[PDB]
Amino acid sequence: XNAXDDGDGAVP
Amino acid sequence: XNAXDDGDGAVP
Amino acid sequence: XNAXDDGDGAVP
Amino acid sequence: XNAXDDGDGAVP
Amino acid sequence: XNAXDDGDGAVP
Amino acid sequence: XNAXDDGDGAVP
Amino acid sequence: XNAXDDGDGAVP
Amino acid sequence: XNAXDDGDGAVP
Amino acid sequence: XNAXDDGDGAVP
Amino acid sequence: XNAXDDGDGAVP
Amino acid sequence: XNAXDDGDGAVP
Amino acid sequence: XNAXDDGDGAVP
Ligand SMILES: CC(C)=CCC/C(C)=C/COP(=O)(O)O
Ligand SMILES: CC(C)=CCC/C(C)=C/COP(=O)(O)O
Ligand SMILES: CC(C)=CCC/C(C)=C/COP(=O)(O)O
Ligand SMILES: CC(C)=CCC/C(C)=C/COP(=O)(O)O
Ligand SMILES: CC(C)=CCC/C(C)=C/COP(=O)(O)O
Ligand SMILES: CC(C)=CCC/C(C)=C/COP(=O)(O)O
Ligand SMILES: CC(C)=CCC/C(C)=C/COP(=O)(O)O
Ligand SMILES: CC(C)=CCC/C(C)=C/COP(=O)(O)O
Ligand SMILES: CC(C)=CCC/C(C)=C/COP(=O)(O)O
Ligand SMILES: CC(C)=CCC/C(C)=C/COP(=O)(O)O
Ligand SMILES: CC(C)=CCC/C(C)=C/COP(=O)(O)O
Ligand SMILES: CC(C)=CCC/C(C)=C/COP(=O)(O)O
Ligand SMILES: [Ca+2]
Ligand SMILES: [Ca+2]
Ligand SMILES: [Ca+2]
Ligand SMILES: [Ca+2]
Ligand SMILES: [Ca+2]
Ligand SMILES: [Ca+2]
Ligand SMILES: [Ca+2]
Ligand SMILES: [Ca+2]
Ligand SMILES: [Ca+2]
Ligand SMILES: [Ca+2]
Ligand SMILES: [Ca+2]
Ligand SMILES: [Ca+2]
Ligand SMILES: [Ca+2]
Ligand SMILES: [Ca+2]
Ligand SMILES: [Ca+2]
Ligand SMILES: [Ca+2]
Ligand SMILES: [Ca+2]
Ligand SMILES: [Ca+2]
Ligand SMILES: [Ca+2]
Ligand SMILES: [Ca+2]
Ligand SMILES: [Ca+2]
Ligand SMILES: [Ca+2]
Ligand SMILES: [Ca+2]
Ligand SMILES: [Ca+2]
Ligand SMILES: [Ca+2]
Ligand SMILES: [Ca+2]
Ligand SMILES: [Ca+2]
Ligand SMILES: [Ca+2]
Ligand SMILES: [Ca+2]
Ligand SMILES: [Ca+2]
Ligand SMILES: [Ca+2]
Ligand SMILES: [Ca+2]
Ligand SMILES: [Ca+2]
Ligand SMILES: [Ca+2]
Numbered sequence: 001x002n003a004x005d006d007g008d009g010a011v012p
Numbered sequence: 013x014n015a016x017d018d019g020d021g022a023v024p
Numbered sequence: 025x026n027a028x029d030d031g032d033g034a035v036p
Numbered sequence: 037x038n039a040x041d042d043g044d045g046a047v048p
Numbered sequence: 049x050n051a052x053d054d055g056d057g058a059v060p
Numbered sequence: 061x062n063a064x065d066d067g068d069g070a071v072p
Numbered sequence: 073x074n075a076x077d078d079g080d081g082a083v084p
Numbered sequence: 085x086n087a088x089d090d091g092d093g094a095v096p
Numbered sequence: 097x098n099a100x101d102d103g104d105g106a107v108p
Numbered sequence: 109x110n111a112x113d114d115g116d117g118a119v120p
Numbered sequence: 121x122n123a124x125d126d127g128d129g130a131v132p
Numbered sequence: 133x134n135a136x137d138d139g140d141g142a143v144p
């Protein structure tokens with residue numbers, strides 16, 4: 001996997 | 013963004 | 025399956 | 037807005 | 049989960 | 061939380 | 073179709 | 085489990 | 097054909 | 109992703 | 121172990 | 133894909 005600090009998908 | 017051919021999240 | 029809006033596992 | 041105690045999005 | 053037609057978070 | 065005896069996610 | 077939350081085959 | 089006479093997955 | 101270990105289509 | 113002009117899976 | 125960001129089995 | 137002689141997941 002996750003990127004973005006917003007979990008899976010959304011921001012990479 | 014998407015990777016994986018499974019849409020957002022899931023497989024990168 | 026999924027619950028929680030966070031994908032598989034994590035919050036049910 | 038927010039729900040979830042996780043801020044905007046994520047868990048409602 | 050989402051509301052708003054603008055994805056996760058932002059407008060409910 | 062978990063269900064399925066396979067841990068978090070996967071089988072509920 | 074699928075059952076199981078593990079995709080085609082495996083758990084019904 | 086299997087259905088279909090094609091093994092696990094595929095036709096139920 | 098299949099790729100991905102998830103059968104036909106889905107992940108290549 | 110897809111190949112084949114027949115969508116996901118089927119002909120690669 | 122796991123691979124794929126889909127948990128145990130599924131995509132390696 | 134599988135490894136381990138125990139099918140998808142579990143032992144790699
Ligand atoms: C090189 C590839 C193909 C991906 C690595 C980065 C990554 C793990 C993205 C997934 O982030 P999200 O789950 O937030 O979309
Ligand atoms: C290196 C980073 C940070 C991302 C590039 C690849 C990417 C855009 C992955 C996101 O895929 P999903 O939406 O399928 O998780
Ligand atoms: C009552 C049982 C046994 C399952 C129904 C609810 C469900 C489908 C949970 C899975 O959620 P996560 O994949 O987010 O853990
Ligand atoms: C009437 C609607 C549609 C929402 C009520 C609760 C709410 C404001 C949800 C948004 O929570 P997140 O920002 O955590 O997604
Ligand atoms: C049960 C609660 C508290 C809210 C349901 C409405 C909902 C699912 C809003 C989340 O929308 P966004 O992801 O657009 O913030
Ligand atoms: C009624 C609800 C909403 C959940 C109860 C069952 C549950 C806790 C599912 C989570 O299972 P996994 O963690 O294996 O996905
Ligand atoms: C009535 C029949 C015969 C099947 C209904 C259940 C079904 C659609 C199962 C296939 O699940 P898997 O793809 O997970 O093996
Ligand atoms: C009631 C359910 C849930 C399924 C019963 C029949 C079954 C065991 C389907 C699995 O067949 P495949 O392995 O061929 O997909
Ligand atoms: C380079 C081409 C054109 C195909 C070879 C690899 C292949 C056979 C992919 C099909 O996988 P799925 O059936 O999992 O989508
Ligand atoms: C690297 C691999 C293994 C595949 C690339 C070509 C491809 C993306 C085929 C998938 O096509 P279908 O979705 O039509 O099966
Ligand atoms: C040495 C071997 C044979 C495995 C290394 C990679 C691995 C740990 C695959 C298991 O991933 P899944 O649980 O997603 O299948
Ligand atoms: C390319 C990678 C990383 C793994 C190769 C070995 C493999 C396909 C293991 C998956 O085994 P299980 O389905 O038992 O987890
Ligand atoms: Ca991810
Ligand atoms: Ca993310
Ligand atoms: Ca994170
Ligand atoms: Ca999100
Ligand atoms: Ca994405
Ligand atoms: Ca895509
Ligand atoms: Ca993906
Ligand atoms: Ca699930
Ligand atoms: Ca979801
Ligand atoms: Ca969840
Ligand atoms: Ca909000
Ligand atoms: Ca808050
Ligand atoms: Ca936000
Ligand atoms: Ca929230
Ligand atoms: Ca949401
Ligand atoms: Ca929204
Ligand atoms: Ca939407
Ligand atoms: Ca759980
Ligand atoms: Ca357990
Ligand atoms: Ca489980
Ligand atoms: Ca099936
Ligand atoms: Ca499914
Ligand atoms: Ca499987
Ligand atoms: Ca299944
Ligand atoms: Ca079966
Ligand atoms: Ca059979
Ligand atoms: Ca079958
Ligand atoms: Ca195929
Ligand atoms: Ca296969
Ligand atoms: Ca595939
Ligand atoms: Ca495809
Ligand atoms: Ca096409
Ligand atoms: Ca195709
Ligand atoms: Ca097919």
Ligand SMILES: [Ca+2]
Pocket residue numbers: 121122123127128129141142143144
């Ligand atoms: Ca594993």
Ligand SMILES: [Ca+2]
Pocket residue numbers: 122123125126127
């Ligand atoms: Ca993982």
Ligand SMILES: [Ca+2]
Pocket residue numbers: 032069070125126127128
């Ligand atoms: Ca999973």
Ligand SMILES: [Ca+2]
Pocket residue numbers: 066070128129140141142
């Ligand atoms: Ca497992």
Ligand SMILES: [Ca+2]
Pocket residue numbers: 122123124125126127128129130131132
């Ligand atoms: Ca996996």
Ligand SMILES: [Ca+2]
Pocket residue numbers: 101129130131132133134135139140141
């Ligand atoms: Ca496997």
Ligand SMILES: [Ca+2]
Pocket residue numbers: 134135137138139
């Ligand atoms: Ca085997």
Ligand SMILES: [Ca+2]
Pocket residue numbers: 134135136137138139140141142143144
């Ligand atoms: Ca195994």
Ligand SMILES: [Cl-]
Pocket residue numbers: 002003004005006007
């Ligand atoms: Cl992250």
Ligand SMILES: [Cl-]
Pocket residue numbers: 014015016017018019
């Ligand atoms: Cl993709």
Ligand SMILES: [Cl-]
Pocket residue numbers: 026027028029030031
């Ligand atoms: Cl959900």
Ligand SMILES: [Cl-]
Pocket residue numbers: 038039040041042043
């Ligand atoms: Cl909150």
Ligand SMILES: [Cl-]
Pocket residue numbers: 050051052053054055
């Ligand atoms: Cl919406």
Ligand SMILES: [Cl-]
Pocket residue numbers: 006010011044045046056057
């Ligand atoms: Cl988000």
Ligand SMILES: [Cl-]
Pocket residue numbers: 062063064065066067
């Ligand atoms: Cl359990």
Ligand SMILES: [Cl-]
Pocket residue numbers: 074075076077078079
């Ligand atoms: Cl399912």
